[PDB]
Every structure is written in structure tokens, then in C-alpha cells.
Design a protein around this ligand. Structure first.
Ligand code: ADP
Ligand code: BEF
Ligand code: MG
Ligand code: ZN
Ligand code: ZN
Lengths: 411, 126, 89, 206, 48, 139
């Protein structure tokens, strides 16, 4: 007997840990090399001093985990090394129940490869993996603390729920019906954290000096200071000076990472040798791409279009309940005023009869997927659903990915 | 009300079969009105009142298939068309059943039954 | 040949001017808003094409064709009639 | 105030058309043989294709991966590579990677090896020695036409394209109080400073 | 003024109100909680 | 009240049903801060719409008490549709599309007397000529 091990293979950070553990760990799934060829791995990337031109190699080419080599390296580093990761150590893998996560639309061959390697090479006793939206309805099984907002004012899983999974790669609209996503109505919003970081790079480089290479600097900027307009783009643009902020550039002799200051608030003076970049419009004009892709000259339909289409493609009888039970998750949703604005726009688009209740977890929304996945893993539903090592051995390798987990079973 | 019974039929985190996807498409099709520009030709008669000639048999067409819109002369014609449809003859010697396949020829294509027994004397691999 | 060059990545290929694939069509997986066979007519087009081709195809080597019109070429019609003998249907 | 009597010419007058108009200063003329050739040979398809290519370019993180975009875009859309390379104007694994992994091995310490042989183990080596890119997977015949088209395309929106209103902002600073279109290429500007910036750096007709 | 139709409105309102009373008796304890059943949401929507 | 999204006039199911144009009900779609509603209107309300010159996107205001249609203006959403245009852009109405309010006012008896003596109704030329006249007190 052993508690299941849960790992969330993020395309930008990996959230993993034993089911008994309270809070998960972090693992930047990216192989880096600096200008002088010295290569950094996983959390070593956070330890870089030559920020300027560090190049990031990743296993997820386009949201699809293609290159196994670095995936295996990162897995082995995070699973084996106990010293950095609070003593957690996957001794040898055999006789360990593993619940994992993957991109909601993975190629059948890629999923076959994934199941084959994770089963034969790692030799786990049992394995489950699926998109986080599959685990989202299970939130009923535990007393979660998730704040909720309604758009019309200022048996261990929920049968009807709609999941918006906004991560590093892409924003997914995944409606799940009684724990199986309605895969023909699944719609992908191509906007995501990678795009948003690139747009930050672009607009910083246009308005100020060229920051096109300063990957970790712009990432720290994005972490420190972005927000969606509380009402509309016009409202934020009118008071740009009132809500203006300045970000202090990193000083390699004192701080490899920069930081943001609020000019209005009283704070310590900056040294005269420190270069400062003021942000007055890019704070809100960049996040507004989500609702108005024309702003950043993108022909794709936006988030409200995508959500309304996904609602439309659903069965008529169930779609109002799906509207009422929409839940938001992912790294991107943590940025302020995104959930409120999305709820307001969604209610404004829908007929007055229906009401939308939007619930987003408090705190860092990226960690929510790991939490709900773990709380699901400790339920009888996981015990019934899970597939065993010998049962995989009995079937030919395509059988598992084509029946147990992958989209192919339905479509 | 019947949709609620259909909803209970929907997969419930189990091992359910593809047939649901047909219902899914049924709901999906409801998204918008169909902007069919030009209505397809219908019926068994020409504009002058003369009966159409069967494409299968060259007999004068007697009936018209409302689902596919292919007019047919006789029951045999309809059956042959249906066998062209339903490629997997779900009887579930099964491979010996008439299996029409389409072969592309210079400037056009023809339907060929791979179960056709060729003339006596064909070599191995014919 | 002048038929519209199919948009990239369609789940079908245009063979002999018609949408076809080597594998058996999986409409249910691939189509969200399938037009009826009535709406498509692809089957109809295929059938007409098939029959016409069988009337005009390369199966048997062609040897005589009615000449596309005091030209003596009219007088050759009875000669070509007599050069063959008549046999039953 | 207002002219109650107007004189008109029956040739020039109609309600359809109202028109009025005025180091050597002269209109620029474009010696672009490519553009002239295009003119004689001939959102639009080219415009949306360029916008999509710009979107995909902006999505990618590392600058060194920029000249690998056209192959990926051709594989994803299905369009020929030469068409996107020429008509549209923009803006991996080696044994050395194995050596870097060997250097990366120094962090991991715990795992221990073993020995066995079978063709299953040969295939186990084969997956762990692929060294092939997502482009190879998409071009691979094992990924079927229906599977590929469903997975990439079906998740894209097909009927709704814009249901929020349309918001135009300054091309330099995003302002909206006043807007006008520059005489040289028709992109939209809001202020004199933005006009000077568009003329010096931005404007694309020069 | 003599042919006003107030009785027709009142009668139809009472027939609706008695149908609604029967439906409320059938449903039981009505609530505005988040719906997890199609039947419950349908009945609440019909009530409103 | 709200912003018009759709306006699809319908004719009678049979041409013999009515006279002349034989215009049946009109369907209008209004948008508010709390959602949208599709309304079915009388042909008289459609005539009022035609009189007020309402197009798609204009914020309107219909009183079921009398059947009077008012054109508030254009939505602020479409403010930047054209970079030079004379249009009174107005924000999207707050609250629900169909809001019922109880109005309380204090009116004098003399106010009623004046209203009866000098009514403001009528759109005839005679009405306009009387409107231009000074409001002299009469016994
Ligand atoms: N404090 C923050 N502020 C804004 N965005 C954040 C913050 N923390 C994380 N993110 C976003 O979350 C993304 C990573 O989310 P993650 O859960 O790793 O998604 P995925 O599952 O796609 O890997 C990053 O790209 C980043 O843009
Ligand atoms: F790993 Be993710 F959701 F891009
Ligand atoms: Mg994720
Ligand atoms: Zn400007
Ligand atoms: Zn210009």
C-alpha cells in the first residue's frame, strides 16, 4: 500500500508531489543554454546570472510533447533528486501508482509513445493521465476554497461543468459532461501565455530599447505587473497616468532579476545608474488582446467568440446548466480582472433567462489543477478508473491510448 | 423531455462507444441555419416531361430516392446503390461479399467489385 | 482538371475530380455539418461519371468513330456497314 | 449662408459623385519590379495568411527558432512552403545534444541499470532515439487525414468570428480620442507626435 | 366601457396560478442553488 | 430599452391574410448589461421604429404603456466605427432589458387645468402653428 503520486507536466512549470503532500513542487520543463554554451536545467534556469540571451529548448514543440530526450532528463531530475525537492525520492518506480496530466488533444502516436515509455521504462504498477478538465468536476469530493462570481450582479463529481484551461501553451475551452469531455465541441483559443509574453517582448522593444532577447526579464515583468481593464479598454486608457507603473531593470551587480515599483506610493529612491522603464499603456493594452484580437492585429476569433461557440455546439437542454457551472483554471487566469471581465462579457452575450456563475480558485490558479487532480486521485472513482500494469501488458500498446485515455475511443 | 433520456444515455466516465458522436453531431448541426445556395436536382422527370434513364441499368426511371437524391429505375438499382453505400456490410466468408471500390481512370472513374471472381485461369496474385 | 484546387488540409483528395481517400470515409469523426448526399450529390456525380466513362473508356481498343460532320465521306458509311457483318443482341 | 441658386454642368454633375481638389516636391513612384509584375499578373487570403504568420512568429519564444517558422506553418496549414516564403514577408537535435544530456546527467544520481534483449527492447531504444520533430510527426503517414484535420482544425472556431464590437486604436500608442488614416499607406494615427513617428520609423510604403 | 374584459384576465391568471400551485406542490422546497440536475433546472425555469 | 441586434419583419403566413403590404409582427433583439432578450412586437411598434429611424446598433427605448418608441442614440461600442461622423454615441443601458419601475410625481390641480386647456398633443400643421403662438392666459 502506497499513496498515489501525482505530477502535472506543465509546458512551462511542472507541479508534482505525493498525494499525501499539501502543496506541490515546481519544475521548469525547459533545457537552456547561455551564449557561452553552458547549459542549465530546470530550476538551474532560475539561477542564471547571464540573463541576456539564454535560449530555451522545450519538449512541447507546439503544445505536443515531441522530443522525449529532454522530457526524460527533466523527469529523472525531478523524480530522483531528493535534496532540492524536500527529500521526495521516487526510488525505482515499480509498485507505484501514478496519476499524470497531458495536453487535452494529443496525437494518437504521441500518446502511444508516452504510455509505452512511462509503462515499460518506468515500470509503474498503475497509471492514469488525462487533461485537467477531466479532473475538474471531481472538485465536489473535497471542501475546496474557490471564489465565485455571478455575471448578473455587481457521485463524487459534478455532472455538468465547463472548464477553461488557460496555460502557457494555449487557452482551451473544454466542456465536460459527467466526467468525459464533449470532445466534438472542444474549441481551442490559440492565445496563451507564450503569445502574451511574445507580445510583451514586441511592445517593450518598440516603445523602449530592444528587449526581444530578454526572456526572463520580460517573464518577470509579466509576473509582476499585468491586468485586464476592469470595465473596458477605454476606461483604462483614460486614466493611464493615474495607474502608470515603472519597472526597474535588473542590475547584474546587484539583482539579476528586475522589479516593478508604483510611482505614486512612497518608496526608497533608485540609484542614478539604474535604468527605468515606465509602463502606462502596456499594462492593459496587452491583456486586452484576449477580448479584442484586432488590437494586436490577429485575425483569429477571441475568447468570448470561442466560449459562445462552445456553448452553442453543446446540447440545448444541458447548455444553460453548463453556463451556470463554468469554472476557470490555469496560469493566465491569475492575472487580475480577467475572471470578472469574462463573466461580465459572457452574461452580456447570453440571453437574460440564463445566468452564468464563474468560480475561479483563490491564490495561484496554476496550482489548482494539481490540487483537484490529487483530491480526485484519493477517491473511489480513481480506484475504479485506473488501469493496471499487467492489464496494459495484456493489451497491445495502441489499445491503452485508443481506449482508456485518448480521444480516439469516442471519435 | 426525450433529450433528458438521451442525456442519461451520454457517457458517464466509462467505456462508452462511438455511437454517441452521431447524437453530438445532431446537436452540433443545430448551430445555425443552412445556407444551401442551390437546391439539388430532384425527381424522375426532365423539364419536358420525358422520363429519366437509369444510370445503373439504362431503364426508364420509375422512383426517386429522397435521402440521397439518386433516382432509380428498379428495386435492383436501389439495392445496388445501397450496397455502394454501407461499405461495411454489418452482418455482425464475410470478405467474400460484394465490395465495390472506385478506380480512377483517365478523365473519370469506375466502380469495381474486388470480390468479383476473375475469369478461370488468372494467375496467383491476379 | 479546371476544378477548384482544394483548400489545403481537407480530409479528402480530389481523385478524377471528386473527393476521395484511400481509407474508408469516417464522416462521423470528421464532419461537424455534413451536407446530405442529396445536398452533396457526390454519389450522383460518381455514378454519371462511371457510366459515361464505361461508354467512352479505354477498356477496348477503338477502331471506328462516326465522322464529325457533295463530300464523298457520306458514301463511306455503307462501305463501313458492309465491311462488317451483322450479329445478334 | 446658403446658395439658393447653383449653376451645374450636365456632363460633370451628378448626385452620385461629389469631388473637389486643389528637393523638387513630386509624388514618389515605386520601381518595384516585383510589385509591377504582380500588378500585371493580377480580409484577403494573402492578408489573413500574413496575419497568421505574424501571429505564429510572435508566439514563438526563442529568436534562433525564427527561420524555422515557414516549414512549421506549411505543415500546419498545408500550404506550399515557397508560396509563404516568397509572397509573404516575415518580420535541431544532434550528438552534441546527447553530450549536453551527459553533462546534464551529473544532476541525477539515483537510477541503476540492467540488461535484457528482445525486439520489444529494440523498439524501446527506438522511441528513446527518435530525434524527429513535430513536423515529421505531422508529415508522417501514420497520422491519418481525418485524425490530423480533427485535432488541429476542428478545435478552431468555424462559425463565430467576432461577436464583441470592433475597437480601433492608435497604431503608435493605442489612443482612441481621435483617429485618422495616413495618406501614405492608410494606417491609423492619433496625434502629431505619432504622425512624426509613423513618417520616420513606421510607414511601410518606403 | 361596458364590454371590458377584466374577467378574462382574472380567470386566466387564476388558472395559471392554480397550475403553478400544483407544480410547486409537486416540486417541494424551491431554491436558487446552482443546478446539478436537468430536471431541477427545467422546473425552476418553468416556475420563473 | 437596450441596443438593437436584430430586426426581421415578417409577413402573414398567407397573402390573403391582410391588406397591401400585409406586414406581420417584427422581431427585435435588445442587449443590456445583464443579457439579451428577443421581443415580438406589433406592426404599430414597427411603424414607430420606422418613424424614429432606428438601425442596428442604436440604443432604443420602448414603453409598453403607450407603445411609444424613443431613439436614445448609438452604442458606445460602435463609437470608433467611423473616424469622422456626427452621431450621439450613448452607453449600453444598465440593468435588465425590461425594467419595471413605479413612478411617483406631485402635480397641482392647476397643472391638470393647464394640460386640458392647452394640450401639447398633435403633429398637424395646425398643431405646430398653435405651438408657435404665445401661451396667453385664458379664462
Ligand atoms: N504571477 C503570474 N502572473 C501572470 N502570469 C503568470 C504568473 N504565474 C504564472 N503565470 C503564467 O502561467 C503560465 C504557466 O502556466 P502552467 O500551469 O505552467 O501552464 P501549462 O499547463 O500550459 O504549462 C506561464 O506562461 C505564465 O504566463
Ligand atoms: F502544459 Be500546458 F497546459 F501547456
Ligand atoms: Mg496545463
Ligand atoms: Zn498615438
Ligand atoms: Zn503609413
Amino acid at each position: 500500500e502506497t499513496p498515489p503520486i501525482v505530477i502535472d507536466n506543465g509546458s512551462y512549470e511542472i507541479k508534482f508531489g505525493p498525494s499525501t503532500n499539501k502543496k506541490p513542487f515546481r519544475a521548469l520543463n525547459a533545457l537552456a543554454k547561455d551564449k557561452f554554451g553552458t547549459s542549465y536545467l530546470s530550476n538551474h534556469i532560475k539561477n542564471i546570472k547571464d540573463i541576456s540571451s539564454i535560449t530555451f529548448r522545450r519538449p512541447h514543440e507546439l503544445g505536443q510533447l515531441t522530443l522525449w530526450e529532454l522530457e526524460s532528463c527533466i523527469w529523472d531530475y525531478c523524480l530522483f533528486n531528493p535534496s532540492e525537492f524536500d527529500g521526495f525520492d521516487l526510488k525505482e518506480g515499480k509498485g507505484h501508482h501514478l496519476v499524470a496530466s497531458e495536453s487535452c488533444m494529443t496525437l494518437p502516436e504521441l500518446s502511444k509513445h508516452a504510455d509505452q515509455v512511462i509503462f515499460e521504462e518506468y515500470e509503474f504498477d498503475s497509471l492514469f493521465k488525462s487533461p485537467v478538465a477531466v479532473f475538474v468536476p471531481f472538485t465536489k469530493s473535497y471542501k475546496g476554497e474557490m471564489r465565485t462570481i455571478s455575471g448578473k450582479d455587481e457521485s463524487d463529481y459534478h455532472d455538468f461543468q465547463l472548464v477553461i484551461d488557460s496555460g502557457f501553451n494555449c487557452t482551451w475551452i473544454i466542456p465536460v459532461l459527467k466526467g468525459i469531455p464533449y470532445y466534438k465541441a472542444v474549441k481551442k483559443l490559440d492565445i496563451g501565455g507564450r503569445f502574451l509574453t511574445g507580445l510583451l517582448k514586441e511592445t517593450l522593444s518598440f516603445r523602449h530599447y530592444n528587449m526581444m532577447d530578454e526572456t526572463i526579464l520580460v517573464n518577470n515583468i509579466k509576473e509582476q505587473c499585468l491586468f485586464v481593464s476592469p470595465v473596458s479598454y477605454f476606461d483604462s486608457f483614460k486614466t493611464k497616468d493615474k495607474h502608470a507603473l515603472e519597472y526597474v531593470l535588473p542590475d547584474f551587480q546587484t539583482s539579476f532579476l528586475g522589479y516593478v515599483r508604483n510611482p505614486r506610493k512612497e518608496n526608497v529612491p533608485l540609484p542614478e545608474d539604474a535604468q527605468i522603464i515606465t509602463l502606462t499603456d502596456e499594462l492593459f493594452t496587452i491583456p486586452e488582446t484576449f477580448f479584442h484580437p484586432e488590437i494586436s492585429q490577429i485575425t483569429k476569433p477571441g475568447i468570448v467568440e470561442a466560449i459562445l461557440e462552445s456553448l452553442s455546439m453543446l446540447p440545448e437542454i444541458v447548455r444553460p446548466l453548463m453556463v451556470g457551472n463554468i469554472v476557470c483554471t490555469g496560469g493566465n487566469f491569475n492575472l487580475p480582472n480577467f475572471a470578472q471581465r469574462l463573466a461580465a462579457e459572457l452574461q452580456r452575450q447570453l440571453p437574460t433567462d440564463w445566468t452564468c456563475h464563474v468560480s475561479v480558485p483563490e491564490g495561484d490558479c496554476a496550482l489548482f489543477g494539481w490540487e483537484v487532480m490529487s483530491q480526485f486521485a484519493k477517491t473511489d472513482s480513481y480506484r475504479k478508473a485506473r488501469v493496471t500494469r499487467e492489464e496494459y501488458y495484456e493489451h497491445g500498446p495502441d489499445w491503452c491510448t485508443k481506449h482508456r485515455f485518448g480521444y480516439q475511443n469516442w471519435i | 423531455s426525450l433529450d433528458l433520456s438521451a442525456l442519461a444515455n451520454f457517457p458517464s466516465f466509462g467505456e462508452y462507444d462511438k455511437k454517441i458522436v452521431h447524437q453530438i453531431n445532431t446537436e452540433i448541426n443545430k448551430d445555425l441555419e443552412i445556407k444551401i445556395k442551390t437546391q439539388p436536382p430532384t425527381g424522375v422527370f426532365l423539364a419536358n416531361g420525358i422520363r429519366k434513364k437509369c444510370l445503373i441499368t439504362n431503364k426508364e426511371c420509375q422512383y426517386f430516392d429522397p435521402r440521397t437524391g439518386v433516382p432509380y429505375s428498379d428495386v435492383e438499382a436501389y439495392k445496388i446503390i445501397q450496397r455502394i453505400q454501407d461499405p461495411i456490410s454489418k452482418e455482425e466468408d464475410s470478405d467474400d461479399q460484394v465490395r465495390f471500390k472506385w478506380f480512377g481512370f483517365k478523365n473519370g472513374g469506375i466502380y469495381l467489385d474486388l470480390s468479383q471472381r476473375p475469369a478461370k485461369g488468372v494467375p496467383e496474385g491476379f | 482538371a479546371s476544378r477548384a484546387k482544394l483548400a489545403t488540409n481537407r480530409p479528402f483528395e480530389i481523385v478524377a475530380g471528386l473527393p476521395a481517400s484511400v481509407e474508408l470515409p469516417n464522416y462521423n469523426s470528421s464532419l461537424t455539418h455534413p451536407q446530405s448526399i442529396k445536398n452533396s450529390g457526390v454519389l450522383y456525380d460518381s455514378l454519371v461519371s462511371s457510366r459515361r466513362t464505361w461508354v467512352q473508356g479505354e477498356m477496348f481498343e477503338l477502331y471506328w468513330r462516326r465522322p464529325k460532320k457533295e463530300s464523298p465521306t457520306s458514301g463511306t458509311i455503307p462501305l463501313i456497314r458492309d465491311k462488317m457483318q451483322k450479329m445478334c443482341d | 449662408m446658403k446658395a439658393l441658386v447653383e449653376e451645374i454642368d450636365k456632363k460633370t454633375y451628378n448626385p452620385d459623385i461629389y469631388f473637389t481638389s486643389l528637393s523638387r516636391p513630386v509624388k514618389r513612384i515605386n520601381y518595384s519590379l516585383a510589385d509591377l509584375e504582380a500588378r500585371l499578373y493580377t480580409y484577403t487570403q494573402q492578408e489573413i495568411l500574413q496575419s497568421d504568420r505574424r501571429f505564429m512568429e510572435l508566439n514563438t519564444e526563442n529568436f534562433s527558432d525564427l527561420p524555422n517558422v515557414p516549414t512549421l506553418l506549411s505543415d500546419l496549414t498545408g500550404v506550399p512552403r515557397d508560396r509563404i516564403e516568397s509572397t509573404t514577408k516575415p518580420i535541431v537535435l544532434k550528438p552534441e545534444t546527447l553530450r549536453e544530456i551527459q553533462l546534464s546527467y551529473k544532476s541525477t544520481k539515483l537510477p541503476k541499470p540492467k540488461r535484457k534483449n528482445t525486439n520489444r527492447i529494440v523498439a524501446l531504444k527506438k522511441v528513446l532515439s527518435s530525434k524527429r520533430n513535430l513536423h515529421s510527426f505531422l508529415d508522417s503517414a501514420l497520422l491519418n487525414l481525418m485524425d490530423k484535420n480533427v485535432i488541429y482544425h476542428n478545435v478552431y472556431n468555424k462559425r463565430y468570428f467576432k461577436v464583441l464590437p470592433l475597437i480601433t486604436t492608435c497604431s503608435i500608442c493605442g489612443g482612441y480620442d481621435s483617429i485618422s488614416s495616413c495618406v501614405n499607406c492608410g494606417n491609423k494615427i492619433c496625434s502629431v507626435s505619432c504622425f512624426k513617428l509613423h513618417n520616420e520609423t513606421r510607414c511601410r510604403n518606403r | 366601457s361596458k364590454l371590458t374584459c377584466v374577467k378574462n384576465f382574472v380567470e386566466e391568471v387564476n388558472k395559471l396560478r392554480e397550475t403553478n400551485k400544483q407544480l410547486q406542490e409537486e416540486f417541494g422546497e424551491a431554491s436558487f442553488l446552482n443546478f446539478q440536475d436537468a430536471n431541477q433546472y427545467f422546473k425552476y425555469s418553468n416556475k420563473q | 430599452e437596450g441596443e438593437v441586434t436584430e430586426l426581421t419583419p415578417e409577413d402573414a403566413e398567407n397573402p390573403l391574410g391582410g391588406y397591401g403590404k400585409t406586414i406581420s409582427h417584427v422581431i427585435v433583439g435588445l442587449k443590456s448589461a445583464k443579457g439579451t432578450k428577443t421581443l415580438r412586437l406589433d406592426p404599430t411598434i414597427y411603424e414607430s421604429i420606422q418613424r424614429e429611424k432606428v438601425s442596428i446598433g442604436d440604443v432604443i427605448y420602448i414603453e409598453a404603456n403607450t407603445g411609444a418608441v424613443k431613439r436614445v442614440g448609438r452604442s458606445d461600442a460602435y463609437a470608433t466605427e467611423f473616424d469622422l461622423e456626427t452621431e450621439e454615441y450613448v452607453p449600453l443601458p444598465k440593468g435588465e432589458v425590461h425594467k419595471k419601475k413605479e413612478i411617483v410625481q406631485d402635480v397641482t390641480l392647476h397643472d391638470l387645468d393647464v394640460a386640458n386647456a392647452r394640450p401639447q398633443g398633435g403633429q398637424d400643421v395646425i398643431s405646430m402653428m398653435g405651438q408657435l403662438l404665445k401661451p396667453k392666459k385664458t379664462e
